Design a protein around this nucleic acid. Structure first.
Length: 313
DNA sequence: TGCAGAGTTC
DNA sequence: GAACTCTG
């Protein structure tokens, strides 16, 4: 999820490209959204979609690095819990999804090791790991469809790459900073407004409305939201500019909770500058895996791999 | 599941 | 009249 409408905002700065443009590139990928998602009674669909993607990547000469979600933050859990209160046993559907995912994790990491692709378990948030990889110039981008990566400092992000009718879109920090006037702090304030995976937003704030807010109270860091907060705590009191529209909407009392901006500003990530390695993928083991989990033979997989191994050489 | 247009309200 | 949402 992340910010509810941020992609709509940034689309003016994103450029449509083709998969042939990622040829000379080393990019990070957040697999955690996939297993976060993944009635024909199929076996291991996470692995199925993962395999097809994994092919698509190497076909276009991408050098991937996969990033795995760790312990979700306190604010992420609080957000999903207060999002389920709106929509004894909640603690027993937590410990049954983790043992299913655990196996999904293990199988996916095995598939990766066979394909010769390295990977890193992010200690808490995975988007933050991909972001800090972008920042230290360890990757040359990050393939993800999650807006929240921007708030963790992202500079170059490739979106809609796997979405097949949608064209691959390349987004750059500098581009939408120079066009839209957005920095990391303004985007985090936008996260307070529009709603994100660490905090639900304001009921009626569309994109344009959140920008109207962030311009009505200019400032540095978190000042805009404090000014808007005390202004709405004042103007709500009764004498009964364009600020009337903003009077109308409802606001929470703890707004703004500074722990939210704190979580986006200083997240937890691996600090070391890893030097990464892509090994050669052994063929036989891959067909063995495919039969073990899907039930594919040797020339059922080879019909798919025939372009892939051809491009590898 | 993302965009694009209209419908409904201030 | 324009902007936001909902649905197609």
């Amino acid at each position: 999820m992340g910010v509810q409408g941020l992609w709509k905002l940034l689309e003016c700065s994103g450029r449509q490209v083709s998969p042939e443009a990622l040829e000379g590139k080393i990019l990070a990928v957040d697999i955690s959204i996939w297993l976060n998602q993944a009635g024909n009674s199929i076996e291991n669909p996470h692995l199925l979609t993962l395999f097809h993607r994994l092919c698509k990547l190497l076909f276009f000469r991408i050098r991937p690095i996969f990033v795995f979600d760790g312990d979700a933050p306190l604010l992420k859990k609080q957000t999903l819990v207060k999002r389920r209160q709106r929509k004894a046993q909640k603690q027993q559907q937590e410990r049954i999804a983790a043992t299913v995912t655990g196996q999904m994790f293990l199988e996916s990491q095995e598939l990766l090791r066979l394909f010769g692709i390295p990977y890193i378990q992010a200690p808490m948030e995975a988007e933050a790991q991909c972001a800090i990889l972008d920042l230290t110039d360890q990757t040359s981008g990050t393939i993800t469809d999650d807006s929240a990566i921007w708030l963790f400092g992202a500079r170059h992000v490739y979106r809609n790459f796997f979405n097949k009718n949608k064209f691959v879109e390349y987004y750059q920090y500098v581009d939408f900073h120079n066009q839209l006037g957005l920095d990391r702090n303004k985007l985090i304030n936008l996260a307070y407004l529009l709603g994100s995976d660490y905090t639900e937003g304001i009921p009626t704030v569309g994109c344009v409305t959140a920008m109207e807010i962030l311009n009505e109270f200019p400032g540095h860091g978190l000042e805009p939201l404090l000014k808007f907060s005390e202004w709405w705590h004042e103007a709500q009191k009764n004498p009964k500019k364009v600020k009337k529209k903003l009077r109308t909407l409802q606001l929470t009392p703890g707004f703004p909770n500074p722990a939210v901006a704190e979580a986006y500003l200083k997240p937890v990530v691996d600090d070391s500058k890893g030097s990464f390695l892509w090994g050669k993928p052994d063929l036989d083991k891959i067909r063995e895996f495919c039969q073990r989990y899907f039930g594919w033979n040797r020339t059922k997989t080879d019909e798919s791999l025939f372009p892939v191994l051809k491009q590898l050489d």
